[PDB]
C-alpha cells in the first residue's frame, strides 16, 4: 500500500 490507494 505504499503509493497505491
Request: net charge neutral; aromatic share 0%; glycine share 24%.
Amino acid at each position: 500500500x505504499l503509493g497505491c490507494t
